[PDB]
Scaffold this active site. Structure first.
Site, PDB file in Angstrom:
ATOM      1  N   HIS A 264       0.869  -1.150   0.143  1.00 14.53           N
ATOM      2  CA  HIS A 264       0.002   0.053  -0.055  1.00 14.53           C
ATOM      3  C   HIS A 264       0.824   1.124  -0.282  1.00 14.53           C
ATOM      4  O   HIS A 264       1.928   1.078   0.443  1.00 14.53           O
ATOM      5  CB  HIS A 264      -0.973  -0.038   0.954  1.00 14.53           C
ATOM      6  CG  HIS A 264      -2.259  -0.744   0.988  1.00 14.53           C
ATOM      7  ND1 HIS A 264      -3.504  -0.215   1.099  1.00 14.53           N
ATOM      8  CD2 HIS A 264      -2.479  -2.072   0.610  1.00 14.53           C
ATOM      9  CE1 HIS A 264      -4.311  -0.993   0.783  1.00 14.53           C
ATOM     10  NE2 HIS A 264      -3.822  -2.246   0.235  1.00 14.53           N
TER      11      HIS A 264
ATOM     12  N   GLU B 148      -5.649  -0.845  -6.872  1.00 12.43           N
ATOM     13  CA  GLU B 148      -6.810   0.108  -6.436  1.00 12.43           C
ATOM     14  C   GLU B 148      -6.386   1.545  -6.461  1.00 12.43           C
ATOM     15  O   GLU B 148      -5.223   1.960  -6.348  1.00 12.43           O
ATOM     16  CB  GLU B 148      -7.305  -0.029  -4.884  1.00 12.43           C
ATOM     17  CG  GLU B 148      -7.605  -1.765  -4.786  1.00 12.43           C
ATOM     18  CD  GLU B 148      -6.222  -2.450  -4.359  1.00 12.43           C
ATOM     19  OE1 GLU B 148      -6.009  -1.822  -3.122  1.00 12.43           O
ATOM     20  OE2 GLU B 148      -6.108  -3.175  -4.947  1.00 12.43           O
TER      21      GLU B 148
END
Ligand code: CL
Ligand code: CL
Ligand code: CL
Ligand code: CL
Ligand code: CL
Ligand code: CL
Ligand code: CL
Ligand code: CL
Ligand code: CL
Ligand code: CL
Lengths: 341, 341, 337, 340, 341, 337
Positions: free
Chosen positions: E42, E111
């Site tokens: 992330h 994402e």
């Protein structure tokens, strides 16, 4: 008839004539009292009937090596369609290095007829002026003979230098009929080249060029003011009129032509053109006195150079006729400035 | 001695010599038995010490108009940095129209030294080959003399036509040292131009060119096979060695040079170069017999044209020396193909 | 049944006037309206260019006329094809059986304002064919995606649709695109031209449709003609010359950017350059014969543009003397669902 | 009231067939509503809402069959669905045909509608910069001269609106952002905002006012407009269920301008509960309470209110407001309104 | 208590925990019977309340050098937003070179939460799959250890080579919940990683992966089938529920989340999430028997590896609790395939 | 206290070996590691290029050394600046007081693999300055945006940070960028060069820092040198010639794309081309005097790259004979928070 030496300019119409013919005719024009050649930089002719478009840069080498004439492009668009400005600078520098005191670099905003072939966005006139101003900056940096870089809106130049230079760079002449670009020409460049037009519009262009030059601290009395005109001479008025109508119908198109892409387009538009649409715009007569009066008038307005394009295919007869009857009778002011280093 | 007429090619090194000098030397070379000129298409020299780079296209017009030599670019990159392929086609067509049977268009993948000035992405060799193949397609469409359009990966051409053409288009010669592009040259173009290299590598290039041509139904025995060599002749072996070392250090750089951007870069790399690094790669001797044997060997490998670049500044003495001692003694096979329409 | 089409010239007339005149035209026997989709007029002298899509809503809500764009370029200058599809679907949903979507390759006069590369005609045809594919996918009423050379459409769906989508009519004067129209679309719209050229376009449209397995006898064949009616032949000629000089410009006009350009070119135009191209006469019999001839060539709809500013008198004159005397084949196809 | 009875009707293109909306607006006129706000959507929020007419065609029908004022609420003129030059032409045409009636409402747009053209979707702040440039383009075109433009986001070649009204329509900016509210007062004619707590509304009004003063304008003569969502029905129960089933996006107290698909909102709707609507959507059958809610907004200083009933009971809602609500609202006299 | 050795996977949640803590907890997890670590890649956490996002690639070096665990990214998007595929390949090759037999490269379509920071067009899922397939091609070419080039729709790779490689490259694992990409994973890559979902949908993914592999001539019986699950264990059911609600509200968001850009967006959406929205989707219980039954069921569906993310901040207690009560009682088939070279 | 820096040459050595040698170097009195950020080695003969960012995690977790990239180009070829910031912040969070972020304008050898336009040095400096702005905004720990000529950063924040961010060190040999380093960043890293040129770089860095209100006497001044130590002068010379021919290439190398290119250029390189540029001797006194001289010029850190493959013997030899005899000014600034 004249304070200064007899002289006149010959327009080499690449739109109409095979380059081998143009070379021979320029050699003849030299013999007949013409002193300079203006040479179109086209890819396409206006109409198929004109039927030619030689690469001017190769041809100019031949002209340089076989005559003592002055010569220039009229005009090259150095704005990155057909030609990158860095290359135009190299071409100009090479020609002047080989033929010192003889070459002048004439530049302008281009027409779609020629530039559309590379299949890029074609900007409006005002924007093309902005592109031209940037191109002028690039050519001038390269003309300094140092290693230069450039990064503006339209062009990027990585570390570049002209190793082949003349002692003094050729003059940059801007060919334009726009008051704004005329001012910028006086400000940024060496001389102005304009097409024929009524007195009011010529006087405005000269005026703008002059005040641009003064604003930038230059002396406009020593900067050339050049005009290109289209005439039709022939043995009779009748052949002179038909010559213009068949060979140069674009001369009767009193409207902006810089967005039209194809010869076939002009040719179709030519079907509208009539003899009346040429008055004021192309002199059509066999009377060589009247040719002389037309040209003298332009000198009197303050042009220091005139380049004459005869629109008929009778180029040899035209050159001899002007040599005998016209060029000797033109009165040029002595020490008028001319496009030269 | 020789089955065919005495002949040889002269390399005009724009990197090193003022174009006015090159014109005079080519005129002399003609007088001395050279038949053809190869002319570099540079913007920059390799080193500041070389110190020149004329715009070849203007110069070629002068050469054409003042000699009867054959001549070609060696080589132009028509891949849209300096030069858009449409324009190269026009230039080639104009030259051949003016000087029929004399011009040959030499093209290649280009080097960053010259192309980097326009500040665009510089692709790797293989990709530049893909660009070259597309450019060849564009030039050939324009050479048909019809109105053509093109849309491929690298180039876009809107409705375009060459109005100024010769009766027969000039041959397209590809300059390459790569086996892949040699095959493609035989398949797609008219002749091959390669630099000097060992026998094994030359024999492979010739072989690939031949089988490319046969695969495409052409007769390779009637297609020119051209080589460009760098030699140093001078009055003694000592001056011959120093001439090479000072004037052409890039000749001792046995490594790919097409990514290096600046003359100043080559000049700094030149500080490493020593006489040893030239063996095999540049012939350095005053013995004109040994010059002749070197050249004859290349003829015997199957080259039909040789272009010789003397690296020293002693160009005039070199031309006279080859004219007397070398060119007359070279045995060319009769009816060997040559770059010509 | 008696019928005729009225051309609403947005180039020349205020849209409030056009609305009133269409309402009158309905009263006088006209059945359908063709409405130009311009941003600019040809000349300043024409002096108008309303946004057609808003105007069509007003026409729909105040008349029972059929109506169509003639023509919209849905190729991503002024208009993205997805939006044209939505507009078409909305109009037909609100006015079912009345709307037809006329599309074409566009002219620079209108499209140049967004300042993008203007491709050559042949390339714009390729763009048009892709746009047609997008509109047709959206007309299916499903969620669709598209990725071609010219357009990208992310997950999109028309939630407001009619039970049956409006027909797609291609406006073209080109033999190639006529064939493609028959192959890909529902009908053809062409400008007035000599018989030889009309007969070639009809012929190409027909054989395009047959090649694709369709029945061209049930597909509309529409023509837009420019006429000048006035009280005398003299005013009819001058009306054409002053109001519609572009009608005398027998040459490709799709690259010219500005009204001021056309206006300057108009100085060349003369009465002779209109023959065959614009009917100029006060004789309403001769108007009728001209129109009947076009029916007989095989056009199933005709849209008439009077070039003069005498629009009200023209509508009344055609209503009395022309429309009642026109013989239309029964069960001729018409732009409709 | 000091001024005449009036109120705005929100035409929800997301939910209703445009033929129905036309009929309902005609009825709303009859019942004392004076103006229509019309959504500019391509997609509805959810499939259950199930519509999205092209507003520009519909507005022509509204103009020609009523005497109502009307506006887009709001069009994004930032070059996804719509190029600003075209929005200008559309606005100029509508006002030319229906003088004194049209107002051009613009805003930064949502991905639901703009994503279909498959271009980079900038963050809100950047879309504001695009909106400010679009405003400059529309205003140049509204001058009626030949204009050119070259900025970061848009290029306009020589363009002119030949069909114009004598006076251009007002540009109203729809925003909930303090920064853009100030810019609206500075650059445009009026403000349109959604419902929110008093503190946040008072901040937006305040910013709009000081933006206008900073630019030498008189903000007391510039419209301040609000759009609210309510649920009226016959009972409180149906009012609550109507909101929950028809307008779940009203319970999504979070920024929604990055979400691309109706199917996305529909899946998110499964989280929404009646509690999530308090403060945000008034859900009651008590028409007195409707009136008090609306009056409060007038008192904050809004000069126009546009009301969206979320239920499908549009006809009953219009009649109910006409009888019980609109007559009892006290508007200050000569309050500014979106118009010539 | 099993045909094969006791083992389980630990999910390192970079979204929630300082990387120093994660290192210590993984070292403990090793001691307690966990055999492998899945590590999120992330840039941003889902919510500010989670409040972390270490750079995984640096952390994995620390894990490698201080444990004997297997480890992998779950998952890296190598599609040219945050990460160019060539660099991912180098990172993967370096890790496996230093820790042979231990690293597995997990990749996926990414994402917006993480990728939007570079401010480029964010394509729809299906298009990002096309980008992923191209990235897979690039990584695999680089993994050959030769000099490679690539030119496709999305990526361009110039002459590149991984000089630092293991003897055998790490496996490429695709993280996806899409039937189409599952088939492509079996066809193109080494193993599948999927999130928890109902049995029907898991069985379809496994099935598609297997038939993709067979269709391409590979043996799916030797290819790992991995699942990542989110659970909440705590001392009571009450703390387990609240832990999930406060720390992992994204687990109750039964809807596609790959377009949402900001943590602040998720945080606002989280206000809607309730305990009911987690049923089926996150196991929330203090009953460690029920944890074991949940995990055993997944083994029985045909998963060969399970990675467990406890959503609570009680990571140490969770690791010890699973070590004592869960891991020892899980029955793995012997010689089941596992992500390893 | 005794200290020196070790250069970890990823170009030449397997990262497993480098880890072991750094662990040994710690034992022998080295205090810090400079780690190359390469994708490719200069030559195939060097034959390695580990991804440094993963390796640094291993170094951090198994030693107590300070360490830094020397240098990362954060200009959007291999690496986007936002990511470099995250990597730096993560390393310093895990190993507080130990990491320093070294950045520079990059070389084509490494960056060309992504197949983008490679700008000239001056332009890459402009890109570097913008990247520095991005890293610094992210280091504030707030949500930040950026929109400049070269980079766009949407709403981004580093949630994993140390209490104090790591210093940004710029690696450059250019007077312009040295001044900008003092103005914008925390410290300077430069290669070995003659006294005059080093003194100019220090001077420019100092006056840049003062102009921006910083105290340059508390800002680190670091130098990286290449040496060849071996048992005899002969092996020292051959080691340099075979392993590090790029050290004899006294010319700009940032445009050359391929290892195979350098390898071919290496055929030119001779022992003479290394004088001034790489110290080649077995005399460890002479090594010490060379290093001490640099300290005396005002460098506060030195990182030493031995070019030979005899890394273990070199580390032990420096540990015994060199590091103990180096005189460092007390309280000299060092790359650390
Ligand atoms: Cl003259
Ligand atoms: Cl006059
Ligand atoms: Cl020869
Ligand atoms: Cl050999
Ligand atoms: Cl009809
Ligand atoms: Cl006819
Ligand atoms: Cl109101
Ligand atoms: Cl496991
Ligand atoms: Cl299930
Ligand atoms: Cl140190």
């Amino acid at each position: 008839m004249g304070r200064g030496s007899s002289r006149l300019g010959y327009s080499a119409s690449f739109e109409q004539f095979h380059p081998s013919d143009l070379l021979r005719w320029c050699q003849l024009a030299e013999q007949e009292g013409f002193d300079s050649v203006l040479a179109a930089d086209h890819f396409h002719p206006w109409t198929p009937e004109q039927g030619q478009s030689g690469f001017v840069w190769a041809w100019l080498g031949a002209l340089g090596a076989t005559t003592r004439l002055r010569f220039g492009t009229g005009v090259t668009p150095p704005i990155g369609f057909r030609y990158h400005p860095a290359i135009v600078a190299q071409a100009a520098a090479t020609l002047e290095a080989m033929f010192p005191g003889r070459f002048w670099l004439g530049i302008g905003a281009g027409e779609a007829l020629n530039e559309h072939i590379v299949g890029r966005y074609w900007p409006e006139p005002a924007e093309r002026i902005r592109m031209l101003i940037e191109a002028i900056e690039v050519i001038q940096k390269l003309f300094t003979g140092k290693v230069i870089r450039h990064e503006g809106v339209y062009f990027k130049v990585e570390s570049a230098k002209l190793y082949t230079m003349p002692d003094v760079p050729p003059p940059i002449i801007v060919g334009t009929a726009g008051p704004y670009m005329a001012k910028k020409t006086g400000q940024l460049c060496d001389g102005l080249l304009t097409p024929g037009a009524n007195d009011e519009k010529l006087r405005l262009l000269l005026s703008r060029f002059e005040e641009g030059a003064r604003a930038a601290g230059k002396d406009p009395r020593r900067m050339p003011r050049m005009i290109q005109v289209h005439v039709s001479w022939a043995e009779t008025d009748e052949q002179a009129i038909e010559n213009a109508l068949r060979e140069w119908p674009n001369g009767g198109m009193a409207f902006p032509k810089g967005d039209i892409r194809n010869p076939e387009d002009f040719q179709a538009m030519a079907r509208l053109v009539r003899p009346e649409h040429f008055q004021g715009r192309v002199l059509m007569t066999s009377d060589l006195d009247r040719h002389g009066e037309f040209l003298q008038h332009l000198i009197d307005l303050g042009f220091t150079e005139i380049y004459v394009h005869n629109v008929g295919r009778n180029q040899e007869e035209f050159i001899r006729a002007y040599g005998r009857a016209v060029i000797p009778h033109l009165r040029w002011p002595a020490d008028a400035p001319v496009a030269q280093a």
